[PDB]
Amino acid sequence: KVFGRCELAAAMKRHGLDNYRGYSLGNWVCAAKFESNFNTQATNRNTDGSTDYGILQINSRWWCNDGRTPGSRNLCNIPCSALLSSDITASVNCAKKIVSDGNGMNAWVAWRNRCKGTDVQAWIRGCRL
Numbered sequence: 001k002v003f004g005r006c007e008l009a010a011a012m013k014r015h016g017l018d019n020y021r022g023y024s025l026g027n028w029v030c031a032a033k034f035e036s037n038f039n040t041q042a043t044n045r046n047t048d049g050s051t052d053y054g055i056l057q058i059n060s061r062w063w064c065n066d067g068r069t070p071g072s073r074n075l076c077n078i079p080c081s082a083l084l085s086s087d088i089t090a091s092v093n094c095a096k097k098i099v100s101d102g103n104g105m106n107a108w109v110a111w112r113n114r115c116k117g118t119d120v121q122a123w124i125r126g127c128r129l
Contacts, residue, residue: 001086003038003055005029006127008088013129015092021099025129026120027111028095032056033123034110040091041084054083054091056108063094 003011009029012018018025035057036042044052050061050069060069064080076094083091098107105111 001040003032003040005033005038005123006129008032008038008055009124009127010129011088012092015089017092017095020096021104023099023105024120026123027105027115029123030115030118030120031105031108031111034114035108040086040088043084051080053080055088056083056091056095057110058083058091058094058098063098 009025012028013025017023017028032038032055036055038055040055042054042057044057046052046059048061050059050072051066052059053064053066058064058076058080060066060072060080062073063076064078064083065072065074066080076097078090078094083094099105101107105116
């Protein structure tokens, strides 16, 4: 599924991401935009043999198990396939564990490079929240 900007903002707010660990809703919507372009089925393979899965591009080396990644730790205790669902619950729940890791949203490259320090409120303006 490909979410619309406002539709995703509402979905994330419903799952308690607004202001979670100090990150306003706009930060999360911005991260999903540049990480997966709002596509729940986006996947990207990396040089270390790991793959990033879903709307928040969660990595198979540390967070989910896809059975083909060496040195996987599966810290979210979930199969990576669950992160490709149309319902973002699994991805959100795992993201909450990642951001609580101790490095905030820097776990998301696209967020660090294109969201951090910008007017992230722009991502929720015009939306009915």
